[PDB]
Every structure is written in structure tokens, then in C-alpha cells.
Design a protein that fits this description.
Chains A, B, C, D: Keywords: Signal. The structure is a homotetramer. Chain A is about 50% helix and about 20% strand. Chain A is an alpha+beta fold and about 170 residues long. The first copy, chain A, folds into two domains: about 110 residues, Four Helix Bundle (Hemerythrin (Met), subunit A) (Up-down Bundle), CATH 1.20.120; about 60 residues, Helix non-globular (Single alpha-helices involved in coiled-coils or other helix-helix interfaces). Chain A has a four-stranded antiparallel sheet. In chain A, a hairpin with a 6-residue loop joins strand 1 and strand 2. The interface between B and C is medium-sized, with 31 and 31 residues.
């Protein structure tokens, strides 16, 4: 999948983060072997050598750990609707719908502005190498029987998700 | 998957909510046919006649719409750690790790209490019929070309996700 | 302030949680004496002997720590809007506005239902004694110079905030 | 208050956003005159002519509406803790505590890195003029008796809050 500006989003890393959360839950749920399976899947997803990880990097954002980079894992939309009289907004929304039908992203943004609607794109990001290290280290702790400590690292990986909300500039 | 109390969680409905969010994004991304495909997948997941939806119902929670019910779609954990001197907490955490290894949920909760750690389970819920109606109606609006209005219903479905955070009573 | 069902909400505890967050930030901001001042204010707010803390208790919710109770610190609204043709919804919303003008909460909920709008009340809660202990212990750690450890307890207090989202049953 | 880089944060705008949320709740709570009072307070806070609003602007972030700017209303911290053996981390945390005592922000960040801890600063931002317009227009709608529509604009103002999470570069 791609952002509004056509930059690639990592579905593998999104699924890895989902697996990380499920893994942590299974530690507390008394299913530590299931937790290891889920963390192992996350490790394979984040370290896939056939994936070109450069494609997902948000270059304009400094990661906390030296040499690391944030990658895009999801995009969503926030709209902000100004008050308009019912009639004027219907006609403006109808034109916005035509641009979406046409695949015209810029025309959609501009028609929505005439409807009093601003658009913000929320890009969910993770630091790639820091997340990889959390997963691999958590698995090592699980191998050692240090399950609570593994859970702390899985939670830290989740807490490293950030959301860059930006106005749409196509 | 199951909660700490062994109640079933709907992976299909979780994926349906993921599909609903992606569908809404694709409307703004100028890919309305992709949005319809994603909403159609969500509709099939939420309306699977081979699924016994009773298994996922949280019976002790009144849904906003008459006749409806909330279903469980995810569980996560929140811990709250009291301050303990480094030595006393290590020994208590080590015993908690043994109970997790043993699959002993109650023993895990009790050992964590000795470590100064309380456990809260966060159950993500959706109203099943209200969400079904949002998806089916959004698809109908997409068929009619009313894409912005479909996006509003998809967002409403997402805003209907609630999180019941409860202390663990096994 | 009060919930939709006229149960009291603690403005003091809300401000205490705000102070707890600011206190934690000031630790990292190199202003540990400011952090102590903010945590001391939170302690005074949560332990005010002139406040009748029973007024804010959500009795139908078991707190994680034995003998403790959750108290209400905020209420907000989530609406869920069904799709209605523009004309029918305007007339229904106009009637909802009259009930709000009249102070008629039940009539507002019922008029909104005719407009295709369901209402959910989100009650933010904290465990009172567990939060008190976090604050007092964090101050003690600050007195000892253990600032990072104090920050962990302040964060734990914040992570103990839960949101009970319930359909409106007046 | 100030960020880690000593940029000013608007306490007035933070309180305005708090007032906006309370105002919206009071509409549904059948207290429309209280909602107007709270929105009027938010309007006065955001439009204070004695405040130098330039002090709070995050210049490196484009606001959705032409001519507008994002302003800082809060800062918080996220830590990410690597796994370290208990002994090595205690000694590293003890040195971090000394730098916080000394007010040495850069030394704190560097000592925390030796403890395996990365620091992210989360800056809560609002678009100033777009938020002002939401509040003033919502009050006008309240004067007209269009309470539900006012609530939509108050919610839109809240949905315009974004969080810029950045690694600490002092
Ligand atoms: Cl297992
Ligand atoms: Cl890379
Ligand atoms: Cl580093
Ligand atoms: Cl290890
Ligand atoms: Cl398409
Ligand atoms: Cl059912
Ligand atoms: Cl109903
Ligand atoms: Cl329809
Ligand atoms: Cl200070
Ligand atoms: Cl009490
Ligand atoms: Cl207890
Ligand atoms: Cl102590
Ligand atoms: Cl009033
Ligand atoms: Cl300005
Ligand atoms: Cl504009
Ligand atoms: Cl107006
Ligand atoms: Na979206
Ligand atoms: Na979890
Ligand atoms: Na509200
Ligand atoms: Na903070």
C-alpha cells in the first residue's frame, strides 16, 4: 500500500507489530510457547531479506538510535469540517465525490477545501532497527525463561510507534 | 484466541475493523474500487454464517442499539509496577516467570502482586449489528458514488470501538 | 461536574493527573524541583481531607488493588451517526437541539436516536488509593534523588487511567 | 512551560482545548448555557491580545489552512528501555539521576543512552487560527440554537490536535 504521496507502506511491519502485541498478551495468558511463535513470526517479517526496506523509510525523520530510520507501517485520514449551510456543502461534497471516482487525489483535496474540509494524513511509523532489536532480544529472553522481561521489551517496541500527522501537500 | 478468563475473541471481526480503516483511507487515496473491495471483505468477515457469533459476546455490556451486543475483538495487558528495592523485585519476578512457564494464569497474577505489579486486561469491543450496518450501508453509498458519505460511516464504525479495562478476576 | 446520570466527577483528581504528567516531563527537562512542586500539588489534591471522595466512586467497577475504588475524573461523548437523507436528518437534529435547550437529557438521547445518532458516554477513571500511593512514593523517590524511578511511578499512575465507555441509560 | 529545546508551550491554549471538550459534553448534558460559558472562556484564551502567539509556533510544520500555524500546547516523554543486566543498568540510571539533579538536559539524554534508554519528546500541537474559527463559529451556532452542529465543530477542534513525536536533539 502507498501514502497519498505514493510512498510505500510496509504491510509486513504492520503485521509484525500486531504479532508483537499478541505475543505480549500470550505471556500473561500462560501460553509462553504461543508467545514465542508470534514473536518469531514478527522477527521473520521485520528481517525478510527479500524485502527492500529502503522503500518504506521516512527520510525526513531522525530515529532515536544512531544509524536507524523510521519506516511507514500505516496511513489514515483525519478530516476537519467547517460549518457550512446544508445546501452549499452538499454541492461541494458531490464534486469531491467525482474527483475520488476519477482517482484525482489533488482534485479531491481541492474540492474538499471548497466544502470546508481540511485533510490530514496520519502516518504510523516505527524505528526499524530498534524494533528488530526489541523482538530478537525478547525471543532470547523467552528462551532463557525471562518472560516478564521479554514482555517489557515487546511493550517498548509498541511504545515506539509514532504518528506523523501532516497536512496534504501533493 | 481467548481472554484471560478463556472467553473467545473474534479474529475475523478484528480483521474486519482493519479492513474498514484501510477502506476509508483508499477513498481519499483515489482508489475507490480498492475501498469497495476492502469493505466487501469486512462485510463477509462480519456476516460469516459459519461463525457462531454468540461465542464472542460480552454479555455484561449493553450496546447502544436495541437488540445489539458487543463482541470481543482483541485483548491486551496493562501492568502497574509499584516501586520495590531492586533485590526484592527480582526474586518476585523470577517466581512470576515460573508460573507463566507453567501456564498458571492465577499463579502468575498472584506472583506479580508479590512483585508489586497489578494487571489490567483491556478488551477491545465492537457492537456487532451496528458495525455490520455501517459496512453494508457504506458499500451501498459507494455503489451510488457517495464516497465521502461512505467514509463517514466507516469512521463511525471505528469510533464505535470501545475498550473495557478490567482488573483480573480469574 | 456531573455525568449524564448526575454522578459527581472529581475536578481535583483530574487536575492531579495533569500535574502528574507535567511533573514527569520536568524530571527529563532538568527541572527536578519543579517536578517535586507539581507532584506535591497532585498529592494535596488527591488527599484533600475536606473532599468527600465517596461522591466520585464508580461502585460497579473492581479496582486492581484490594480495598481500592475507581473514581470518575472526566466524561466525554462519542456519537455514531447512521446515514440518513439530508432532509430527514435536518428535521430530526432540529428536534434534538430543542431538547438540549430544554435541559432534557432523556429527550435529547431519544431525539438523537430518531436522527440515527447513538450516544456513548466515556468516563475516565483512576484507582484512587493506587494513584495516591504512586504520587507519595514518587515524591519520596525524588527526595532520595531517584528521579528516573520516580518518573516510572508517575507514568504508572497515568497508565492506570481507564475509560469506561457505556451506552446512555438514564 | 518550555520544551526540551526551550521553546515555549501555551498553557492558555492547553486550557482552551480542555474547555472545548467540557463545552461539548455540556451540550449533551442538557447544560447549553454552561457550554456557552466554557466555549467563551476558550475563545478568550485563544484570542488574548496580550499573548505573543509567535512564541508558541512550531515553524517547521505546515498547517492545513493557508496562513495558519501549529502552536505547542503540551510536551510529554516516551522512554524505550533496552534489556540490560540488573547491575549494569542500576549504575547507569544512577548517573542519569545526577544529570537531572544538575539540570543538564544533554547529559541526562547521554546518560540514559548508556542505560539503554532512548528518549522521545511528544509535542501536542493545534492549528491556531483553525481552532479559533471552530470556537467562534461554535459559539455563533450556540447563539442560534444549533447545539448539535456546535458540538460537531468542537469535536473537529479536538480532532485537530496532533502529536509530533521527535527524538531529542539538543
Ligand atoms: Cl502455548
Ligand atoms: Cl534501511
Ligand atoms: Cl544511539
Ligand atoms: Cl539476553
Ligand atoms: Cl482502485
Ligand atoms: Cl449475536
Ligand atoms: Cl435503538
Ligand atoms: Cl443508501
Ligand atoms: Cl526546577
Ligand atoms: Cl473512598
Ligand atoms: Cl492487591
Ligand atoms: Cl522509597
Ligand atoms: Cl446550564
Ligand atoms: Cl501567529
Ligand atoms: Cl486552505
Ligand atoms: Cl453560523
Ligand atoms: Na482512514
Ligand atoms: Na498485551
Ligand atoms: Na465531549
Ligand atoms: Na511526560
Amino acid at each position: 500500500n502507498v501514502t497519498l504521496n505514493n510512498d510505500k507502506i510496509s504491510g509486513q511491519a504492520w503485521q509484525a507489530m500486531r504479532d508483537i502485541g499478541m505475543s505480549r498478551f500470550e505471556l500473561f495468558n500462560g501460553r509462553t510457547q504461543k508467545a514465542e511463535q508470534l514473536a518469531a513470526q514478527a522477527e521473520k517479517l521485520l528481517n525478510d531479506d527479500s524485502t527492500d526496506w529502503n522503500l518504506y523509510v521516512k527520510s525526513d525523520k531522525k530515529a532515536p538510535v544512531e544509524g536507524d530510520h523510521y519506516i511507514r507501517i500505516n496511513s489514515s485520514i483525519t478530516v476537519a469540517e467547517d460549518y457550512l449551510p446544508a445546501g452549499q456543502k452538499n454541492d461541494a461534497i458531490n464534486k469531491a465525490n467525482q474527483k475520488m471516482k476519477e482517482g484525482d487525489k489533488k482534485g479531491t483535496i481541492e474540492a474538499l477545501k471548497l466544502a470546508g474540509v481540511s485533510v490530514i494524513e496520519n502516518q504510523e511509523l516505527i524505528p526499524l532497527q530498534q524494533t528488530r532489536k526489541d523482538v530478537t532480544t525478547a525471543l532470547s529472553l523467552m528462551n532463557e525463561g525471562k518472560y516478564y522481561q521479554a514482555g517489557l521489551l515487546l511493550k517498548s517496541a509498541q511504545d515506539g510507534i509514532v504518528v506523523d500527522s501532516q497536512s496534504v501537500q501533493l
